[PDB]
Design an enzyme around this catalytic site. Structure first.
Site, PDB file in Angstrom:
ATOM      1  N   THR A 193       0.834  -1.261   0.000  1.00 47.31           N
ATOM      2  CA  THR A 193       0.000   0.000   0.000  1.00 47.31           C
ATOM      3  C   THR A 193       0.807   1.221   0.000  1.00 47.31           C
ATOM      4  OG1 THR A 193      -1.867  -1.042   1.485  1.00 47.31           O
ATOM      5  CG2 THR A 193      -1.754   1.302   1.354  1.00 47.31           C
ATOM      6  N   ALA A 245      -8.087  -2.287   6.389  1.00 48.34           N
ATOM      7  CA  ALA A 245      -9.169  -2.080   5.464  1.00 48.34           C
ATOM      8  C   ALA A 245     -10.497  -1.685   6.214  1.00 48.34           C
ATOM      9  CB  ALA A 245      -9.446  -3.355   4.603  1.00 48.34           C
TER      10      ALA A 245
END
Lengths: 196, 212, 222, 249, 231, 226, 204, 232, 195
Positions: B1, B49
């Site tokens: 990420t 998430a």
């Protein structure tokens, strides 16, 4: 430590030693492991010492009130009281009680409660930790429906073996006899069975 | 990420990658990490998430509700300092956050705030967040210019993610571009990393670890 | 001691169609090397044209499915028999997951049906919440066997034209629901061979705008 | 259950709280009681009365020990005296004795019993106490000390005082018999004698209760061998003892 | 005197006056007629709007997929009870896998109404519900009083001018029970019944609301063009 | 810490050491260790030094309450059953091991209580670190039916066994003798062994030996007014 | 490490005839680093002197705690609190926080105004009243203090014999201990007159 | 926390055409010692449902308490709740399930595995399983504990799927369950010769056959074996 | 951690805090202020545990300002320090502590004197003519004994401080990208733009 109770024709006879070891040093040797929780229903304590006594006081409080409002409890009733305190604090209160008693309607009954708290009716019980040496002796030579004389020897002779093979069992053998004639204590000193 | 934003004199380019993971394998590559809080505030999903996706939508409850009571759409600063207070209750309860709330208002200009799990709240004008934050910094910071154009600032964004995609294991997928103006965010399209890589290499004559 | 979560295996594959949706999953139910049952569904109808499967660890699966079928009921009751969207079902599911975040749910939950464009949707969630609209996605044990294959045949991923040699991408395909069904059973036949947590029975809920169809097909039992 | 959370002690329109005044009415119905503070003791005296002569008054306590240095005597309601003696014992030990290791000074215990009076004018659902107490005591810092606690919730230190049905006669007799210097034997001689012009029933030691907080005793302490501790300065006199001194009036 | 503004005080004539006054809340409400058979129960309700521009007030409330309640009292008070019935219907399904029995659901209902008539600041609910439902014992119609008393009936009515409906049903009692497997007629016999409670109020496609429950039908509410084939 | 509690025919005698330790270092050569619940219920305590002093002070509080609420003497059992109950709730997080002794109208008593809520009864019990040693001497000389003048000697020699051979124990030996319907006698410092020799010299110093940097006078008094 | 040895500190206290003296060091460390050579550990409520050793913050917390309790005592009963009465309050405050306690070790030192007797007492962490009529020592150089103090001391000293003994006792443990020293203040407490005398001593 | 103390053995079971068979043995072992013999683990509930419980003896007793209260609860109000709204097997099941889940969440579990064996009012068979993880499932063959991988294989060789339940009669099922007790009895080191057996039929009601022994054991072969391999 | 030195000259308190803030592996921001104005003549600088610091600096600034607008008279440095001391005391008994070390400098207009104070994470107030927290402390408490003199002027004091910084810069293996200086004096709270 060895505790037992045996049913016989006239009622039930309870039996205990008196040695309570902690570690290698015997704290007390004249311990009276036989406790009155009503007046015709006596119990036998084994396991974690403070946690059995604490429960017994509460059971005593339950039955003294039970008598005063609803009428006299039974072996069955008293054992039930016991179970439900061990069962609902079953992670931290660690208790093996043999609840034995003489009813005027059903005679003697014995219940055994191990450390989880589950009642089980038995025609003699043994629980403890010195009673793992006399398990095979107690079953072979026991008879259901023995006369009085016989019963007192059966419990003596077993505890004599328990004394011999278990060093956490010792001293005096205490017996309390619960019958319709009443409540009679017998005491047997060591020479009296070490003779055999 | 890898997620970033940087102010320049047109506003804020916000760019993110679109691959995420669990384990040592690609769980999804369809995930969009640019969570609309408002239609005037964009927030980014990095770290966990669930936690980012949940709270940033709750911040937009409290943003919408702000507008009604004061009759006036919220500041960027006021948005960030709601989320910081909330988060900080859940500290030492295992709560991981790692978002930037970015907005353009007429009383602050472009502004970026970074909010953290820990509950730090830092202002500043280049913020790169993710496992690949080390590789985004490089390319961004060597060609940053405040006095920069809007064509050129979207391409500077594009490319910070494409280095990051290349070298970081966990980034990839697509690059997302956003130009945040005063009148809300415009979406400046989707570029697959698969298709993008070889076009940039052909144009710039960059990439020369990679055979071609 | 106590250990509070297990796993009961199985696998699901939700494929969002173009005007249909399909939600398949094996019905194999296991614990350790034991086969609990040959057949025991992991795809549940919730009614109002949304199918749901939570596959993972069974006990959570049953409860979170259950708490969804009440949130369906209560929606009809107090918003007065308005239609419940797939899109509104998703948001709702996220709070159900997230409600417990400190003793969390353990199931990957995939829903599917048709929303308000009439196009297939599949929404897949991670165990502590988060969700994403996908075109295809798997969950469960065996999910990484089924996924890279499905990407190959649906999204034509990494297939280029013959004679171009990469300059042109292979053109996309318009699908019909039988084309797809063929593909579901086959990918599952592979997973069953090559993994030990898949097999026995295959249960395929299809959503079309004409109602929710249930079609059973066997697998190999091993 | 409860559904009262508003006072029933309320001000009247010309001022003065109606309820604290009524409660003071119930006190002057009750028995006559007195306390005389001397230079070496405090003597207190009260008159004992029963339902019937088949009722004993030897198993009823109209003089109580709160701590081994500070005693109580009342005029007013028996029931109110009962609860207010027990709550005082409980607060004497819990709000000072544990913490400070010794029993409270006479002033300090008086101050505490005055807040209990206060919370039965204040707080919903309660009415005031209907006793006026004399709390006589001894502490190391005020010497011997006499206080009169009332239902109002205020206390006043006295030199000698009376409460009850004979209160007005008693204090006119006490004015002329208080002297600057009073010995403990003289103090007993005034207190029995005052109470005797406020008796019209039987006069015997079984109907007159007398208690001294004289000087200390190392014979009701229960032990010997710690010279720090000096026993009870409180010493209630049995019926016989009081009776010798009635024949010596 | 003050026996009438205190819900905790009797009443030298052996009543409480508040439950009685609360029973008068039903008389000023609108009319509804229920009739049931062994396979189908029916509610036939007269909705009543305020003025020309006002809508008509729904008087059949869906409680479940096989249970329905209808008010005839005051509407705000009915909204507390409607939830309560729903709550105990989902709890019975949830825990015991049991579509909550109709007869047992009455007994829950009693004790919710009682505990506020025992208590001060409380009130008896002013609403009185007629509760239909289809379980394994067949169809049932309950009449719930504000008293908290529930009774089980072949057909009854409550509201305004309720007595005339009870008469139409007292006569036609032995006709509709022996109708079974024909919901069409069961619906028709209640239309005639609620017509005796009118006073030039008529029945239109905006006034009539019917809801039925079956052994082969769930819970359904007909309204609009669906009751226009049963005028 | 050696603490005996020896029952005898007309009463009970309980004796203890005067040593209070804090780690290996001897805090106090002489300190009290026998404390007073009630004037007829004495106790001595072993285990953790603070939790001996406070738990005695506390069940001390409630018994004094209780004895005056009942207008009667406070019984040995009254004390015993509150101690017991109180200690069990914290499930053996309060470290106290008390020998509880006393007389009351219903006879002579003697108990021991563990930190949880075991309670035992003999006619001789001992707790402490000295427990082992103490106990040995008792079992040889002891018989049933001992006189007072007998009892006290048995108590003294029993603690002295404690002093010689245990290191948590030392210094003077305290006694408290209780007989039924006679005053309870505290004989603190009954038997003194280990009397400290004369030091080899004085270590006194002439004036001015140490160096002061500065001096001041600082005020402990209230503000005055002329 | 140790929660009572992370800034060190010591208090010594001695009795004499008709006088007491108490004394503390002035060191506040944070581990190895010395931060301050002028933090008091002795305080005075009235004519009682309460020296408090152990963790840095609980010295200060506990000072304002007893500041609160001493005010209410004086106001109600209209005198300054006596040494003996106060010792009981020092015990109870520690014991209230029986679990997770105040990581201190105070010393009470006074001369009673109602009897004229030197009176001293001590406490551990949990607080057990330690009677003495010798001296009580507390802190992190307390092992050294217990030996050193006993050796010089002769039972009963004159008011200015007492300054020479308790000064040397304090110096010599404090320069053989690493977390003690670094400037020190010795007090001589007579009937009505307290002198605070700082000491010249080793700073290194 | 709660961890097992005193534990039973196994309750084993299978479906057949007109009902279900379920059988369990009478044992409370306290680890090494096989301490309670003749303490029964099948509990008949209602009149058509036998609920066979494995795992903890303590916990089991206290769940028998709740079943007995539940018959008392369903009887109340209604006189037709003992005739056509009786306690069905799916009912007795649902409550046992829901209790397990909720106790699992507070992290003090009721450590039991239950089979709830019965026949519906509709005549359908019901054999359904729950354990202490909170997991539910139905199968044609079901078994608790150790028997879920010992006894379960043999039983499951008679009924393989849901189309050999019609073809398995009351006499082939009787045999298979007998057989599986004996297979357990050899290779399971916590077992007892005495076992209780229930047979649930859809026309003769519940029959509760107590105090069977296992017979027809093999041991005749064991005079032949000598040493471990080196000794002959 | 981060630099945090105080030095109190006869007419001004000179506080300094580090610019660099490193959260993660990378410096993310290089000019962030680590101070809050409590009162016009009272300044609090902080460094400590990331994300406790923001909440504890802003919490105390709400409560002190509330007290100031009430009486329209700002509390002494002496008072501020004690209130600061009090919370940190409470926070280590509580379930999760605030571990935020603060140097409080203020001009006391009632003694007409500058004063500096040090309060550590445990909550120990100490008056000091210079002080420091964390590892930063180790290199400058010794260097400061050498050149400090109580009767210095502000501009003398600024070159001493730039000596202190210089010593840290080499011997510390952690970057701080120089200090920002802020002075607290009786004409207000001012800044210096020179390092």
């Amino acid at each position: 430590t060895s505790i037992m109770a045996v049913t016989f024709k006239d009622g039930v006879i309870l039996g205990a030693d008196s040695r309570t070891t902690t570690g290698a040093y015997i704290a007390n040797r004249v311990t009276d492991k036989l406790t009155r929780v009503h007046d015709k229903i006596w119990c036998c304590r084994s396991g974690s010492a403070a946690d059995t006594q604490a429960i017994a006081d509460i059971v005593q409080y339950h039955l003294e009130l039970y008598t005063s409002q609803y009428g006299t409890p039974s072996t069955e009733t008293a054992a039930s009281v016991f179970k439900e305190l061990c069962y609902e604090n079953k992670d931290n209160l660690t208790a093996g009680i043999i609840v034995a008693g003489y009813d005027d309607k059903n005679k003697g009954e014995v219940y055994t409660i191990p450390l989880g708290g589950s009642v089980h009716k038995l025609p003699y019980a043994i629980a403890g930790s010195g009673s793992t040496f006399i398990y095979g002796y107690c079953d072979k030579n026991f008879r259901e429906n023995m006369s009085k004389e016989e019963t007192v020897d059966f419990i003596k002779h077993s505890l004599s073996q328990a004394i011999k093979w278990d060093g956490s069992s010792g001293g005096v053998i205490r017996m309390v006899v619960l019958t319709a004639a009443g409540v009679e204590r017998l005491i047997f000193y060591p020479d009296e069975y070490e003779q055999l | 990420t890898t997620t970033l934003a940087f102010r320049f004199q047109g506003g804020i380019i916000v760019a993110v990658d679109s691959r995420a993971t669990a384990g040592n394998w690609v769980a999804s590559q369809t995930v969009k990490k640019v969570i609309e809080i408002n239609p005037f505030l964009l927030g980014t999903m990095a770290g966990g998430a669930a936690d980012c996706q949940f709270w940033e939508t709750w911040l937009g409850s409290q943003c919408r509700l702000h507008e009604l009571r004061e009759k006036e759409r919220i500041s960027v600063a006021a948005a960030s300092k709601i989320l910081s207070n909330l988060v900080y209750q859940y500290k030492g309860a295992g709560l991981s956050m790692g978002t930037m709330i970015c907005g353009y208002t007429r009383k602050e200009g472009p502004t970026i705030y970074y909010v953290d799990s820990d509950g730090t709240r830092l202002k500043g004008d280049i913020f790169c967040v993710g496992s690949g934050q080390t590789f985004a910094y490089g390319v961004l910071d060597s060609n940053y210019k405040w006095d920069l154009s809007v064509e050129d600032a979207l391409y500077l964004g594009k490319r910070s993610i494409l280095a990051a995609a290349h070298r970081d294991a966990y980034s990839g997928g697509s690059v997302n571009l956003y130009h945040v103006t005063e009148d809300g965010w415009i979406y400046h399209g989707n570029h697959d990393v698969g298709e993008l890589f070889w076009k940039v290499k052909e144009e710039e004559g960059s990439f020369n670890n990679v055979i071609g | 001691q106590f250990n509070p979560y297990g796993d009961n295996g199985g696998t699901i594959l939700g494929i969002a169609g173009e005007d249909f949706a399909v939600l398949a999953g094996d019905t194999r139910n296991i614990t350790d090397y034991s086969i609990n049952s040959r057949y025991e569904p992991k795809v549940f109808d919730c009614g109002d044209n949304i199918v749901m499967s939570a596959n993972g660890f069974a006990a959570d699966g049953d409860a979170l499915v259950k708490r969804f079928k009440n949130s369906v009921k209560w929606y009809h009751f107090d918003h007065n028999d308005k239609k419940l969207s797939i899109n509104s079902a998703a948001r709702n599911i996220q709070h159900l997951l997230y409600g417990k975040r400190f003793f969390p749910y353990y199931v990957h939950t995939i829903i599917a049906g048709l929303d308000e464009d009439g196009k297939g949707a599949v929404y897949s969630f991670d165990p502590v919440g988060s969700y994403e609209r996908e075109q295809c996605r798997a969950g469960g044990a065996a999910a990484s066997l089924i996924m890279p294959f499905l990407d190959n045949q649906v999204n034509f991923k990494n297939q280029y034209e013959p004679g171009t040699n990469g300059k042109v991408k292979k053109p996309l395909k318009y699908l019909s629901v039988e084309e797809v069904i063929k593909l579901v059973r086959d990918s599952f036949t592979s997973a069953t061979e090559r993994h030990i947590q898949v097999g026995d029975g295959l249960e395929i809920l299809i959503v079309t705008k004409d109602g929710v169809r249930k079609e059973f097909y066997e697998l190999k039992r091993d | 259950t409860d559904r009262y959370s508003f006072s029933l002690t309320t001000f009247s329109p010309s001022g003065k709280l109606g309820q604290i005044d009524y409660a003071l009415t119930a006190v002057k119905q009750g028995v006559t009681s007195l306390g005389i503070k001397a230079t070496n003791g405090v003597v207190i005296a009260t008159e004992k009365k029963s339902s019937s002569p088949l009722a004993m008054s030897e198993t009823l306590s109209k003089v109580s020990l709160l701590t081994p240095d500070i005693g109580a005597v009342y005029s007013g309601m028996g029931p109110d005296y009962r609860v207010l003696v027990d709550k005082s014992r409980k607060v004497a030990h819990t709000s000072y004795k544990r913490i400070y290791g010794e029993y409270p000074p006479t002033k300090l215990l008086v101050s505490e019993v005055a807040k209990i009076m206060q919370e039965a004018t204040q707080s919903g659902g309660v009415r005031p106490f209907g006793v006026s107490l004399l709390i006589a005591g001894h502490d190391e810092f005020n010497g011997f000390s006499l206080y009169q606690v009332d239902p109002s919730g205020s206390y006043f230190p006295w030199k000698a005082t009376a409460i009850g049905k004979g209160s007005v006669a008693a204090k006119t007799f006490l004015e002329k018999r208080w002297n600057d210097e009073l010995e403990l034997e003289d103090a007993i001689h005034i207190a029995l004698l005052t109470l005797k012009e406020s008796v019209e029933g039987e006069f015997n030691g079984d109907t007159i209760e007398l208690a001294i907080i004289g000087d200390e005793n190392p014979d009701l302490l229960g032990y010997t061998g710690i010279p720090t501790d000096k026993g009870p300065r409180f010493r209630k006199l049995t019926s016989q003892e009081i009776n010798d001194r009635l024949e010596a009036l | 005197n003050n026996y009438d503004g205190d819900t905790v005080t009797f009443s030298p004539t052996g009543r409480l006056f508040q439950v009685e006054y609360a029973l008068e809340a039903i008389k000023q409400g609108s009319v509804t007629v229920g009739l049931r058979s062994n396979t189908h129960a029916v509610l036939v309700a007269l909705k009543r709007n305020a003025d020309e521009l006002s809508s008509y007030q729904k008087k059949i409330i869906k409680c479940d997929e096989h249970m329905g309640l209808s008010l005839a009292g005051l509407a705000p008070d009915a909204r507390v009870l409607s939830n309560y019935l729903r709550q105990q219907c989902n709890y019975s399904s949830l825990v015991f896998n049991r579509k909550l029995a109709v007869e047992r659901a009455g007994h829950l209902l009693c004790d919710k109404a009682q505990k506020n008539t025992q208590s001060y600041g409380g009130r008896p609910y002013g609403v009185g519900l007629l509760i239909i439902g289809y379980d394994k014992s067949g169809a049932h119609l309950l009449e719930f009083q504000p008293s908290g008393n529930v009774t089980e009936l072949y057909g009854t009515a409550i509201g305004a001018r309720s007595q005339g409906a009870k008469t139409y049903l007292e006569r036609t009692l032995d006709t509709f029970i022996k109708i079974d497997g024909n919901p069409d007629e069961l619906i028709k016999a209640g239309v005639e019944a609620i017509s005796q409670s009118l006073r030039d109020e008529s029945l239109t496609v905006d006034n009539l609301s019917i809801a039925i429950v079956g052994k082969d039908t769930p819970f359904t509410i007909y309204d609009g063009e669906a009751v226009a084939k049963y005028i | 810490t050696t603490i005996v509690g020896v029952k005898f025919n007309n009463g009970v005698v309980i004796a203890a050491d005067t040593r209070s330790t804090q780690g290996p270092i001897v805090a106090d050569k002489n300190c009290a260790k026998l404390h007073r619940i009630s004037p007829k219920i004495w106790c001595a305590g072993a285990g953790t030094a603070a939790d001996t002093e406070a738990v005695t002070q506390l069940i001390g509080s409630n018994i004094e309450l209780h004895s005056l609420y009942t207008s009667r003497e406070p019984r040995v059992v009254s004390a015993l059953q509150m101690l017991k109950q109180h200690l069990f709730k914290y499930q053996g997080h309060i470290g106290a091991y008390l020998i509880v002794a006393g007389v009351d109208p219903t006879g002579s008593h003697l108990f021991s209580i563990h930190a949880h809520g075991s309670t035992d009864v003999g006619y001789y019990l001992s707790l402490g670190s000295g427990s082992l040693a103490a106990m040995a001497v008792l079992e040889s000389h002891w018989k049933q039916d001992l006189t007072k003048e007998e009892a006290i000697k048995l108590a003294s020699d029993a603690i002295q066994a404690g002093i010689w051979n245990d290191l948590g124990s030392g210094s003077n030996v305290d006694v408290c003798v209780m007989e039924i319907g006679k005053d309870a006698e505290y004989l603190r410092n009954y038997l003194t062994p280990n009397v400290r020799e004369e030091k080899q010299k004085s270590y006194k110093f002439p004036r001015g030996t140490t160096a002061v940097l500065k001096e001041s006078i600082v005020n402990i008094c209230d503000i005055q007014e002329e | 490490s140790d929660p009572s040895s992370i800034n060190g500190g010591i208090v010594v206290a001695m009795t004499g005839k008709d006088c007491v003296a108490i004394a503390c060091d002035l060191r506040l460390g944070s581990q190895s680093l010395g931060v301050s050579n002028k933090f008091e550990k002795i305080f005075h409520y009235g004519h009682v002197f309460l020296g408090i050793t152990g963790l840095a913050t609980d010295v200060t917390t506990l000072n304002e705690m007893f500041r609160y309790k001493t005010n209410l005592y004086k106001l109600k009963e209209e005198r300054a609190i006596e040494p003996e009465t106060f010792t009981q309050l020092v015990s109870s405050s520690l014991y209230e926080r029986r679990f997770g306690p105040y990581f201190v070790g105070p010393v009470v030192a006074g001369i009673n105004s109602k009897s004229g007797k030197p009176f001293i007492a001590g406490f551990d962490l949990i607080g057990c009243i330690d009677e003495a009529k010798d001296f009580i020592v507390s802190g992190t150089a307390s092992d050294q203090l217990f030996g050193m103090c006993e050796s010089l001391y002769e039972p009963n000293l004159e008011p200015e014999d007492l300054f020479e003994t308790i000064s040397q006792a304090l110096l010599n443990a404090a320069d053989r201990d690493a977390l003690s020293g670094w400037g020190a203040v010795v007090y001589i407490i007579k009937k009505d007159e307290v002198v605070k005398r700082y000491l010249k001593m080793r700073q290194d | 926390t709660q961890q097992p103390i005193v534990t039973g053995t196994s309750v084993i079971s299978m479906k057949y055409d007109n009902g279900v068979i379920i059988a369990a043995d009478n044992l409370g072992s306290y680890g090494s010692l096989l301490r309670f013999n003749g303490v029964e683990r099948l509990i008949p509930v209602g009149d058509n449902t036998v609920v066979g419980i494995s795992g903890d003896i303590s916990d089991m007793q206290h769940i028998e308490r709740l079943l007995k209260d539940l018959v008392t609860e369903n009887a109340y109000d209604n006189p037709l709740a003992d005739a056509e709204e009786a306690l069905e097997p799916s009912y007795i099941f649902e409550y046992l399930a829901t209790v397990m889940y909720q106790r699992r969440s507070k992290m003090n579990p009721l450590w039991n595995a239950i089979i709830v064996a019965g026949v519906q009012s509709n005549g359908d068979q019901f054999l359904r399983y729950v354990n202490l993880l909170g997991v539910t499932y139905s199968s044609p063959t079901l078994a608790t504990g150790f028997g879920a991988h010992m006894a379960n294989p043999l039983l499951r060789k008679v009924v393989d799927r849901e189309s050999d339940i019609p073809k398995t009669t009351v006499q082939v099922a009787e045999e298979a369950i007998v057989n599986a007790m004996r297979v357990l009895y050899y290779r399971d080191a916590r077992s007892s010769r005495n076992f209780s057996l229930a047979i649930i039929d859809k026309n003769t009601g519940l029959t509760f056959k107590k105090n069977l022994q296992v017979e027809n054991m093999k041991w005749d072969f064991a005079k032949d074996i000598k040493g471990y391999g080196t000794q002959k | 951690m981060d630099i945090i030195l105080g030095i109190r000259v006869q007419d001004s308190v000179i506080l300094a805090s580090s610019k660099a803030v490193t959260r993660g592996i990378s410096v993310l921001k290089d000019s962030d202020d680590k101070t809050r104005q409590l009162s016009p003549h009272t300044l609090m600088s902080f460094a400590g545990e990331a994300g406790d610091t923001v909440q504890f600096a802003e919490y105390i600034q709400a409560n002190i300002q509330l007290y100031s607008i009430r009486e329209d008279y700002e509390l002494s440095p002496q008072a501020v320090s004690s209130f600061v001391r009090q919370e940190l005391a409470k926070s280590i008994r509580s379930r999760r502590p605030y571990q935020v070390n603060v140097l409080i400098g203020g001009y006391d207009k009632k003694k007409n004197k500058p004063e500096l104070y040090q309060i550590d994470y445990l909550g120990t107030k100490v008056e000091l003519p210079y002080g420091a927290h964390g590892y930063s402390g180790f290199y400058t408490f010794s260097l400061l004994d050498h050149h400090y003199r109580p009767d210095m002027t502000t501009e003398e004091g600024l070159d001493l401080l730039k000596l202190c910084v210089q010593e840290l810069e080499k011997r510390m293996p952690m970057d701080f990208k120089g200090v920002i200086v802020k002075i607290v004096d009786k004409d207000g709270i001012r800044q210096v733009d020179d390092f």
